[PDB]
Design a protein around this ligand. Structure first.
Ligand code: HEM
Ligand code: Y6C
Ligand code: Y6C
Length: 153
């Protein structure tokens, strides 16, 4: 459980993401793929890491980054009351895409990295810790739903 104050720190920095969801999404996915290139294998080959400029020019990558951050922002605004939003995400990510929790840890790391790089004034230790707790709760709850669907990843 997060405190109300911790939720507020989470949603305060999230409002900065909402000013430009696509740009944040691009930086987060580029960080993910550079730091953990194996995560490209969950998409069509082109399993090969392209240059940063090719990733920034990609209409498909920019769309993916907005798909992710739209869904995650709706989850964070529920302040832990997110069973109904996690249900369809667990369904697809466990049964169709097959995304292991360790890849959700990787993308959580990439989100925290970009938020710290772009908004340090809104992302000191207390806010970083609140965002860490919020993303740990997301991963814990999605993992329990994965198991309910028979996926142990
Ligand atoms: C914060 C974490 C994430 C969120 C909120 C998220 C959200 C979404 C949403 C909303 C969709 C579209 C609807 C659907 O298929 O469920 C989607 C599709 C997808 N996601 Fe995720 N995702 C996350 C993490 C990841 C990660 C880490 C990977 C891979 C390493 C991944 C792989 C996919 C794939 C392969 C698709 C299908 C894309 C396509 O067919 O074009 N997701 N995701
Ligand atoms: C590969 C690269 C290119 O520029 O031709 C390619 O099109 N394959 C591919 C990679 C990829 C990576 C991350 C997310 N989504 C994708 C793709 N999505 C749809 C079709 C192909 C994709
Ligand atoms: O565009 C597509 O049709 C498929 C994906 C893909 O990654 N192609 C590439 C394949 C490679 C193989 C070996 C080394 N480098 C690369 C490479 N380097 C940069 C950008 C793209 C690629």
């Amino acid at each position: 459980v997060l405190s109300e104050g911790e939720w507020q720190l989470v949603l305060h920095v999230w409002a900065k993401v909402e000013a430009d969801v696509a740009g944040h999404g691009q930086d987060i996915l580029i960080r993910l793929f550079k730091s953990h290139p194996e995560t490209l294998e969950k998409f069509d080959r082109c399993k090969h890491l392209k240059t940063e400029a090719e990733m920034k020019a990609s209409e498909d990558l920019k769309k993916h980054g907005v798909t992710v951050l739209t869904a995650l922002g709706a989850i964070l605004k529920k302040k832990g009351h997110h069973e109904a939003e996690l249900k369809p995400l667990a369904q697809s990510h466990a049964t169709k895409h097959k995304i292991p929790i360790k890849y959700l840890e990787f993308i959580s790391e990439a989100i925290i990295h970009v938020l710290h790089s772009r908004h340090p004034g809104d992302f000191g230790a207390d806010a970083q810790g609140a965002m860490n707790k919020a993303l740990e709760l997301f991963r814990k709850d999605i993992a329990a739903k994965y198991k309910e669907l028979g996926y142990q990843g």
